[PDB]
Amino acid sequence: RFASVYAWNRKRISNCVADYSVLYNSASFSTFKCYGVSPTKL
Amino acid sequence: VGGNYNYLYRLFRKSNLKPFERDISTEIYQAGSTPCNGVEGFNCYFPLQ
Numbered sequence: 723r724f725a726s727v728y729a730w731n732r733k734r735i736s737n738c739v740a741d742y743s744v745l746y747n748s749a750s751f752s753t754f755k756c757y758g759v760s761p762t763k764l
Numbered sequence: 765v766g767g768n769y770n771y772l773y774r775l776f777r778k779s780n781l782k783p784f785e786r787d788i789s790t791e792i793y794q795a796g797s798t799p800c801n802g803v804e805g806f807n808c809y810f811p812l813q
Contacts, residue, residue, distance in 0.1 A: 747797040747807060754806075 740764055775813035 725731035746754055746761035754761075778793050789811070794800055796807030804810055 749798060749806070751806070 772812050774811055776809040776811045 742761040742764040745751075774787070776793065776795065777787075781787065792800065792802065792804065792808055792810050794808045798805070798807040800806060800808030
């Protein structure tokens with residue numbers, strides 16, 4: 723279930739581990755672009 | 765006005781050049797895990813712009 727347009731939900735995340743390489747690379751994703759960062763960092 | 769798009773630059777590449785090295789390849793190279801061969805569908809780029 724997703725936040726709707728005009729009912730957004732921006733979750734703050736900290737002091738943890740995440741794999742942005744997987745988040746980026748998986749074939750299930752339709753599109754991806756970064757702004758000053760790279761998913762290969764994590 | 766239409767733009768002098770006859771001049772090109774490398775937008776995406778896999779490795780750094782050595783001094784005075786030139787690389788004129790038009791091969792599509794992968795950015796991520798998908799082979800993405802002959803396409804720009806997902807996780808790759810045509811390196812020139």
